[PDB]
Amino acid sequence: DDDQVAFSFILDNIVTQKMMAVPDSWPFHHPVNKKFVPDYYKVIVNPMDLETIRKNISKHKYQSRESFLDDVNLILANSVKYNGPESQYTKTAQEIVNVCYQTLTEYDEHLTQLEKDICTAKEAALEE
Amino acid sequence: DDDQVAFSFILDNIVTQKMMAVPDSWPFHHPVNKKFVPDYYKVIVNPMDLETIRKNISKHKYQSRESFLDDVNLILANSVKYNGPESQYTKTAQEIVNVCYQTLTEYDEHLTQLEKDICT
Numbered sequence A: 001d002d003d004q005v006a007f008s009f010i011l012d013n014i015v016t017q018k019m020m021a022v023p024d025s026w027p028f029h030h031p032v033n034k035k036f037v038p039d040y041y042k043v044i045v046n047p048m049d050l051e052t053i054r055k056n057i058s059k060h061k062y063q064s065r066e067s068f069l070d071d072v073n074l075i076l077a078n079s080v081k082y083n084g085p086e087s088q089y090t091k092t093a094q095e096i097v098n099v100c101y102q103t104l105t106e107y108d109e110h111l112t113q114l115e116k117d118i119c120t121a122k123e124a125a126l127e128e
Numbered sequence B: 001d002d003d004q005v006a007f008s009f010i011l012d013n014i015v016t017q018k019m020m021a022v023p024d025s026w027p028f029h030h031p032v033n034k035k036f037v038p039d040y041y042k043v044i045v046n047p048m049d050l051e052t053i054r055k056n057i058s059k060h061k062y063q064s065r066e067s068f069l070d071d072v073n074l075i076l077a078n079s080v081k082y083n084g085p086e087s088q089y090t091k092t093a094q095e096i097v098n099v100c101y102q103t104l105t106e107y108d109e110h111l112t113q114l115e116k117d118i119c120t
Ligand SMILES: CC[C@@H]1C(=O)N(C)c2cnc(Nc3ccc(C(=O)NC4CCN(C)CC4)cc3OC)nc2N1C1CCCC1
Pocket: A027, A028, A030, A031, A032, A033, A040, A079, A082, A083, A089
């Protein structure tokens, strides 16, 4: 029962303590306000930000690194398309991605254990 | 779609800030260790405690007050059966239930809205 809660708990701390701690990362903490910036949402088909990711964590959307990294990489891919590949904002998003992979790698063996246990538990549960 | 996370978050603060705060409530904060007290689990068929309630909350098990109160009332009902109706332990367990309904009622009007939006 503990494993999904623990994994989400770790992800959410990686976000708040490492990713949101990157200098000048504030533009990526919250969604672009669509009421104010409509052109953003005509350009970006799948907008993403760290707050949306935290909401996903709190709902336990991520059961492994891979779908979590999909949304994290999306924050960079969107920045590339809207701000340009050489933008200061994009360089900041690049750093957010790097610190993410750096942190996951530092805890690889622990996260792999959580992922295995989350996945075997869903197997046994549904079987039942 | 914030509503289940919001309802779970409120329940968890009622537990840590109000229920676990009644004096001498510590015996009800964690399970009876079955390795040391086997007679508890031969007498009590559905043992319950605050930490198990918190884990269920973190799993979003409770989608309304009704199933949440079932597990809270279980902690008293178990104490009546094992410790006696008149025990000091049972008296404190009564206060945990009392502060629980007292806190839920104070925010009743906010929680009913959360419950509706969870079902929708
Ligand atoms: C879409 C481009 C890029 C991006 O990729 N993302 C994700 C982004 C997301 N959210 C924001 N948000 C805000 C940006 C600026 C302001 C703000 O208050 N700016 C002041 C306005 C008055 N002016 C005299 C001084 C500056 C408020 C924002 O949200 C409340 N900006 C973002 N930026 C950039 C980061 C700074 C410029 C725009």
